[PDB]
Amino acid sequence: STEDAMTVLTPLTEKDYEGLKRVLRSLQAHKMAWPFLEPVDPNDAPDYYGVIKEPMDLATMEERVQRRYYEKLTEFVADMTKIFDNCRYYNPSDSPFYQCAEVLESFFVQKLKGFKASR
Numbered sequence: 001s002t003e004d005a006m007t008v009l010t011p012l013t014e015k016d017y018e019g020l021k022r023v024l025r026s027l028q029a030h031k032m033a034w035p036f037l038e039p040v041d042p043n044d045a046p047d048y049y050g051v052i053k054e055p056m057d058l059a060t061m062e063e064r065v066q067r068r069y070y071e072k073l074t075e076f077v078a079d080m081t082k083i084f085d086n087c088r089y090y091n092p093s094d095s096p097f098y099q100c101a102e103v104l105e106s107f108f109v110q111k112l113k114g115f116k117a118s119r
């Protein structure tokens with residue numbers, strides 16, 4: 001589709017970045033986002049950094065947005081998907097963190113579709 005191709009190929013503009021910030025702030029404000037605001041503490045999660053190859057959290061994404069790290073929407077989506085995929089990979093499906101990942105990714109997908117349509 002056009003949205004698929006734009007996501008992979010169209011460089012993010014200044015206006016795009018304002019939308020990225022709105023999406024990120026919406027995720028940070030969500031009731032289920034608190035496990036993802038800051039990096040996992042090793043005292044909360046034995047072996048976490050040895051198991052998870054590419055850790056990610058919303059504070060790292062915020063820094064990257066502020067530094068204009070992302071050139072394509074795909075890269076932003078990839079970092080966000082790391083947050084949820086890492087959580088579900090490390091934790092069993094009955095973990096409360098796994099449940100938060102399910103809810104918050106669903107919210108992200110809704111917001112992401114709105115952002116793609118706006119471009």
Ligand SMILES: Cn1ncc(N[C@@H]2CCNC2)c(Cl)c1=O
Pocket residue numbers: 034035036037038039040041044045087090091097
């Ligand atoms: C296993 N495990 N442990 C903690 C955590 N979040 C922390 C809680 C408060 N700050 C970050 C996640 Cl996401 C996780 O998967």
